[model samples]
Target: AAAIGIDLGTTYSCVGVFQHGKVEIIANDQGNRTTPSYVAFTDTERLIGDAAKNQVALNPQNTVFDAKRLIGRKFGDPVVQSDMKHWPFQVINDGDKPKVQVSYKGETKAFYPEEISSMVLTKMKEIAEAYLGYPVTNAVITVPAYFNDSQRQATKDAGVIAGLNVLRIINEPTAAAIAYGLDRTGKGERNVLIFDLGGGTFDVSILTIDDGIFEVKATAGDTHLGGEDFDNRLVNHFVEEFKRKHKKDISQNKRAVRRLRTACERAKRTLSSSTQASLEIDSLFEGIDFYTSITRARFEELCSDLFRSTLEPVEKALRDAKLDKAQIHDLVLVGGSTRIPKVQKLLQDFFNGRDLNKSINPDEAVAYGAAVQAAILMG
Candidate 1:
């Protein structure tokens, strides 16, 4: 028997285990530490993780991504309505809730947001089981700290449907803090702020730690802001370029959109490390190839609004916590989106050019901390 810590993320998920007083992030069968939060239904079989995301462009109608955003939200919810525009799959209103319809095993099956998320959780559990070579029932899962009661219960419900004995549902930023706590070489009361910008959501939490005790002062975030939005901005910029060059609008073409999205998403990562990244999509539409290079400066300018909004939550959380920017001893950055050089610079500028603590792996920190908590509960 084994207990695992699961970071049920919006765009990616991670599972970790603690053994012999050490926390280890378990890799999926595909040899990746973090798995994409994707689920797809094919005519012959269902898929999750990398496989599911791989076929997203091919089987857009049957694949589901970002179930975390839809979880616990009603169909008429304003945010849901806005997000639905980007999705290629069908999301129909099932009474007040959003229900996803997909073709599976030659039949049309509908699933609610909770049900869709459970599939992702089930895949995460399977990954843990395969790695541990044993059954895993007890687990600690993390949700965004800003998650409401309904969303928390919905996530717990997802774990239940996945057949796990979820011992606790912790906050994602708090988990990151715990992971940071264990990595620190110091001992004393310290105030820290966690800025977490993931694939689909942004979160900022302020916490105080003393003698191994952690207290979260305040949290704030935008439900629809994240790395994916940055990618979207890049995609739209190129799309506009395509129209200007070829004088055609390929925006309505799903296949072209998928390919363009893939190129921009990959380039987004490259732009983080390089000063410039070139985007290319062969035969994007109408037998015309698309090519463009965007400088890191231009990338920042295109999505400047989204980047600027991230600071609002940080300011709000600081005010709510009754702490000044100087009071925050450490500005901890979490989530894959934080890898962007521009994002890091923005935060650093807000704090008067102070250094940020990037010791922990942003992608795996939440799960690492979740595993820490799981070890405590199982101990």
Candidate 2:
């Protein structure tokens, strides 16, 4: 039996294994290496990953995304409080911790964070098992370096509920470093900065690799910062734009808001490589069509503060590592949000114009590194 690695992220998840002395990412039934971290409930069946993500517009109340942010958190957590108004689903107080209540089969069911996360893990496990043609049991999972004991334990519980013996919960930056370092046979000590901005969380870690040792010097991040926040910025902009043009408040309509969110997400990605992005939705709100364009400059301006917020963590990590920018050997970009041109440019400029090390796929590197660790444990 082979040990596998699972990257259970806020926006996406992936499973991988060390096979034939190489790291191979196992795709789900949808033939995608990365699966959207979403779950949807219906009268008869539960949908996971892409299937769940596809139903967000039509079933916003039953579809859950970004549950990782609420995992192990208190009901009164500032983040939960702020998020309560945004999600269409009902989040109720479950003693100290929060729980999500969703209507399934005409009955409302409340789920703990671990339960929601377990659904995603179960999907990944099935994908790995199908691909490996075996009932694999043990696994290594990756988490943010700054995750507290409760959060870490919650993640482990999620894995256990998914039927895998949770072998380890490795730090995400450490995992990314392992994936980057394993392939390089070059000798000598090196300092690496891992800049990870995922869909729902952001973290930066400084690591020193000497010989076979990989040690994380320091780490810092804002759990609330990530691509989802960027998308929210766009979503808010569109909401106001729709109100301005149609003189109608579409925010109350969950379906319309979901449609706008989908368009905003697409526009955010398009602006990463293009100078401008356009959003067109037929009958977007109450039979009124909506079309608009936002220049890259405007989008950047709207999200400038969010983009800037990430740098503070970068500075704090460097300071805690007791290293100056000049001492860093290479800057490794991890997480999907690193693809933003402005994010890349800002980091490049901050690191004295050093080209980012892109040897690994940002989306898959964390899971890949977890696979490397699994390989070690198996050996």
Candidate 3:
């Protein structure tokens, strides 16, 4: 048996295997490496990860997503109230605590954020079992560097509730730095910055390592900024254009909005490598039509404001780390959203052409780092 290294991400969850001086990601049954950190309770069974994520288009009302935002937060917190005002999901105040309940099969069931997240962690455990071909019981988990004490405790509790012995909780950037140091070549001393922008959260961390002493100088991030914002930019773009071209007010229709959201995400992925892409959306008030020709430049323009928001934390990190661009030896980028050329170009420009290492796959780096930490724990 081996220990499972689970990256309990805000928007997705991933598991890795550590053995014989190497780490490998556990692929899901869908042949995917990452699973959406979502849970859906159907009348037949509980759906998690990819199964829950897949239903967003048809059953957005039942799909509980981004529960991390509600963890450790009071139901009446000003920010929680603001988020509830616009979020598609329904949130209710259960005294001082917040509860997420979704309507499914004509019934509504209530769940605390921890209980919902436990389902995601449980699914990761299953993936680890399938990959290692053993009953792995002990594990290490990773949480955002900016997570407060209560948030961290909630995540730790989630692992326990999922039936795993979580030996330690590691900060996400430290895990990334550990992965970078072990995977890449070494040096005498180095100051590094980790720019981790994941699906639902973003973190900027500055650290220095000397003679195996890894000290986190400072860290900052936004819980609301990430791939979800980019997806919204694309969705809003489509909605405006669809209404203008078809002369229909589609914003008020839930089904139309959901379909457009999915289409926008598909187009965003396509624009990752291709110059332009198209997607079809149904229920355009009267009918459906194929919206085409979403170019990379247009996508960038749509997300320009969001990209600007990521820069503040970068500056905050540099000041806190007490180093300028020339003084810092290395810059490492992590998380899936860094693949966007908008963010990549900004970092390149800000660093004055400093080398940005992407050797480790952003999607897999955090979980791999968690595995390396698990190895440390096992020893």
Candidate 4:
């Protein structure tokens, strides 16, 4: 009998196991610690993780991404309506709740967000079972710190649908702090702030750690903001640039949008390490070539609004915690979006020169903490 922890993220997922008094991340069949949170279907097979992510460009109709954003929400919710516009797949209303509909092998089928998410979880369970070389049946899962009760229950339901007895649902920021706290040998009370910006959500949490006792103070965030929005900023810029040069709109073309999307993510990553990056797409609009340059300064300027948006949550969390910025003794960063240099610099400056915590892998911290919790429970 083995128990594990899973970080079920908006864009990626990771599984970890407690072994020999330590948590070790378990790689999926693709030999990756983090698997893309995507699912795609063909006539005979359902693809998950890397396989599903790889098919986005060619089989966008059957591939689903960002299902986390829609899980456990009603069709009347404003967020679901807003998300429908950006997603390539179909999101339809099923009486009172929103459901995803996709064509699979020439047949259209509607699925609840929980079902889509369950597919991803099922794949993770398979990975865990294979890695442990046993029938792993119990697990702990993680979700955003600010997820509502409905969303939280939906997550647990997803685990059940995947055939695992979900022992817990921990907040992502709290999990990160737990992982960080576990690495500390010296123990005194300290105020800590956790900044979590994943692919499709951003959350900031304030906490107090006293000799291994962790107490959450406050948390705030936007479920609609994250790295995907940053990519959209670049995509929008390219669309406008193409219209200006070619006098045509390529945004409506699925293939063109897919090409630009892939390029945009690559360029965003490139800009993180360089002062300037290039956006070049052959046959981007009406069979015409599109080329442009994006300097780090310009990229920052374009996304400055988004960068600033994250701070409102930070201020709100601090206000709720009844603390000043200077009172924060330590800062922890989590999620893939935190890798952006501008995000790091702004947070550091906001904290008045306090260095951001780098003790844990931002991508794997939550899963590792979940593993720790699982160990404590099973013991």
Candidate 5:
């Protein structure tokens, strides 16, 4: 018997199962725990995860990655167009909806954002069913707390398309809090501020826990903000460097921009721990040596805008919850970006002198919390 838990996040998805009275994450076919929430169909491989992401650098227009940002959005929105310029895929207006068109093998295939997300969900399900050695039927999926009705419905539709019986659409922050509470087995009372900054969206959820009651006092964040924004900042920096080094504007070439995106992601990760990192742009102007030296200070300066962007919502959540910084007993940070040193400093300063609970792994916390919810469901 297998009951699955799906952390259906904007940037990634993690599946879990309760077996032998314990909750465990079911890894993907790649033997990795987390799967990037990107999808691509091509002549060689129908859908790609690890290997396919490599192609994204070469054929950015064909990989429908980051479609989560456009979920439940309208076609004519300025934000959609603005975001389109960053992605490799082409955006087209089909009637009243915005569709992502990807070119594979000289043929263009168009799909809605929901369809793109469903493919990732379907792929995860295949792994779960195989890992469990049984037909994985239903799952408790997680979503952002600030997701509106339309966005929530769209996630549900993706689940349906993926052929999974969605048990519930749990909020990401709430799920994090639940996982935290379950781990500590904390009793009495506590108010937790969950700062969740993922690839596509950011969520600040103030949650209250007393006895067994798990209540969300307030939640606020920009669905358009997160690590992806940081990625773009780095990508833009790389673009400028390319122009400076080669004395030629690389932005004019869409394919070159795609290659930069892949490098931007790698450089972003490298700059986290290293002071100076070099981004090697392969095949630039017939295999020219086009590289950018990114210092840690430079990276933080470029990404500071995004870190500062999160402050307003934290204040709003505190006011909405009728709790001040001093009143908060615990501040829990969740999401991948929280691992960055700048984010940690920003959070500490915003809370005056409060300490952020660093006991949980930021990347795995959501899925672990999803597993906690699955345990509750099983019981």
Candidate 6:
């Protein structure tokens, strides 16, 4: 039996366990290392992960997402209001707090953000328990470094409600630093930068470490910038191209837009490994099938602005960290979005040819570090 580590990510959640002097990622029942951060309820049953995601488009109102964004935020908060305005699920105000309302089991119900997060946490806990063959009760969870005190507290409470002893809540980037440190060959003091551009957020953090102990120097990020924006850039690219080439306005077609966005997301991923990728849809609009190919060069051009903006935080981090590029020892890349070839090349070029840190699994580094922290605390 082992305590678990959880990365409660915005788009997906992952679990890991530290044992035998290593971190092993635990896969859920769906046989995936990461699970979609979704929770849904129907007249007869509850659903989660891919099962929930499978029916989301069909049961939009019952499927709740963006739970990560709503947590620790008030309905009265202006930013939350603006983002929630176009949401499918109903949100009600509760004494300045906010709760999502949905019909479950033939009754109307509401859930506070912490409650929603707890459900997701419990799901992660279950997956770990199944893998570890025990009723796991202790854990370390990771959160964004920029999260306010209340936001961190909300994450802590979510873990508490999930029937686990929440031993620590570490910053996401700090967790990456911990995981990065294990790869070192010496006790040489090093300054490391972690570039994390995940599905919903972009974070750049600089830290220094000696004897495996770390101090966060500085952090910067664009909360609203990440892979989603890149996907949107491609989606809009194709949508406008269709209008010009086929003279059809499929942007207003709900189903067409959704399908196109999905295709664009896949194509963007394809362009990461291949020079070109195809985007096709049957009967895109007005009996016109859409078929087109996008070269890697064209894809980069479409997302040039977005790609460029990512560097702003990197430069800000260096400034805030009070170190020149030459002073920094290693630059580690974390998060799935860092897998993009253009993103990687731009970041490397900015460092004056210094090699980006390698070896850790970027997609699971946060969770791996969380597991390492759990082991440290449990001892």
Best by TM-score: 3
* TM-score quality measure for candidate 5: 0.86
Number of clashes recorded per candidate: 0, 0, 0, 0, 0, 0
Task: Name the runs in model 3 displaced over 4 angstroms.
Answer: 104-107, 182-189, 282-285
- What order do candidates take by TM-score, descending? 3, 6, 1, 2, 4, 5
lDDT tens per residue, model 3, 305-365: 8998898999988888778878777788888888777788899889998888778888778
Q: In candidate 6, which residue ranges exceed 4 Å CA deviation?
A: 182-189, 244-246, 280-291
Relative to the true structure, how large is the alpha-carbon lDDT of every model? 0.88, 0.88, 0.82, 0.86, 0.77, 0.85
Q: In model 4, where do residues sit more than 4 Å from their true spots? A: 93-95, 182-189, 210-213, 240-249, 274-295
Which sections of candidate 1 miss by over 4 Å?
74-86, 92-97, 182-189
lDDT of 1 by residue, 43-109 (tens): 9989999999888888988999889988998899897899888887888897889988889999999
> lDDT tens string, model 2, 1-379?
9999999998999988999979999878878899998999999889999999988888888998878888878888898899878778899997878898999988999999899999999999899999999898999999888778988999999999999999899988888878876435355778889999988778889888777677789989987788888888898888898888778899888788878888888898898779998889999877999988999999889999889888888899989999999989878888888988899989998887898977677889899999999888878
TM-score of candidate 2 to 2 decimals: 0.89
Q: Estimate each model's TM-score.
A: 0.91, 0.89, 0.92, 0.88, 0.86, 0.92
For each candidate in turn, give its C-alpha RMSD to the true structure in angstroms: 2.5, 2.6, 2.3, 2.8, 3.2, 2.3
Q: Give the TM-score (vs. native) of candidate 4.
A: 0.88
The residue pairs found clashing in candidate 6 are none
Clashes of 4: 0
For candidate 1, the 10 contiguous residues with the lowest summed lDDT are 180-189
Error of 6 at 259 (Å): 2.6
Query: Per-residue error at 70 for model 2, in Å?
Result: 3.4
Q: Pairing residues by index, what is the TM-score of model 1? A: 0.91
Model 1, position 178: C-alpha lDDT score: 80
lDDT of 4 by residue, 253-277 (tens): 8888888988988788788789999
